[PDB]
Design a protein around this ligand. Sequence first.
Ligand SMILES: NS(=O)(=O)c1cc([N+](=O)[O-])ccc1Cl
Ligand SMILES: [Cl-]
Ligand SMILES: [Hg+2]
Ligand SMILES: [Zn+2]
Length: 258
Amino acid sequence: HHWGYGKHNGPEHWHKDFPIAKGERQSPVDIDTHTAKYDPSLKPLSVSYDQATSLRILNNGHAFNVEFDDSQDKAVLKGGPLDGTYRLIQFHFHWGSLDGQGSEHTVDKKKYAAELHLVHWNTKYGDFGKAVQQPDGLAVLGIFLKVGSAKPGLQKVVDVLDSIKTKGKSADFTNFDPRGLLPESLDYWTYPGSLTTPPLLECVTWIVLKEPISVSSEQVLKFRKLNFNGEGEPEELMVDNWRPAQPLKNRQIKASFK
Ligand SMILES: NS(=O)(=O)c1cc([N+](=O)[O-])ccc1Cl
Ligand SMILES: [Cl-]
Ligand SMILES: [Hg+2]
Ligand SMILES: [Zn+2]
């Protein structure tokens, strides 16, 4: 009985094996744009993905990960609310069964069709493993996806999904440039949070971009062809793999823009 997104193992059940699910800084959260406050103390956000080196793509049972070689100082996120440098290790998405839902964070209660998460670990901690034992160990750059015009830079990911349909399958995925998945503006909202998936560790500084990227209906439709199940098992489409908004509690969301 592994955690998942179904009726008997979904978000409302996670707290049993992962008590921190009811913690003080859980993610995602609803971003109330009117309550968010512009923060002058925030420094310019820096996303440097020019040397990013992808290795492979994997269906892990709850989503698919595009993994990067993080053994060297490449693909780094710094500035903004961050102290020091954070290194990109992987990115993945959360999406719905319909265009009207799919994102984890919401904006004034609005749900987007999907949400992209670029995961980075604080280099001061040596590696990802040690980083997730720290309150400021991770930084996730979140980007909303809406259905409209296709995103050319996403097609290479879409076309390889047919090879990793079921849980456990992986495939080489080199030379993929994540810069092609970024919107024009880096305006963002930021707050202290957690992993949105078990173990739900509270080590994340969330940086959610205001401007969504547009992807085509065809592209998201292919995301929905993936399977939660492993090969040879009854088909359970990989859809609605998103956790709903959690209590903001003692937290303030800061905006990088006026
Ligand atoms: N959703 S997330 O970005 O908080 C996240 C997801 C996973 N995952 O479910 O593979 C690992 C790390 C992080 Cl920070
Ligand atoms: Cl597991
Ligand atoms: Hg999983
Ligand atoms: Zn995620």
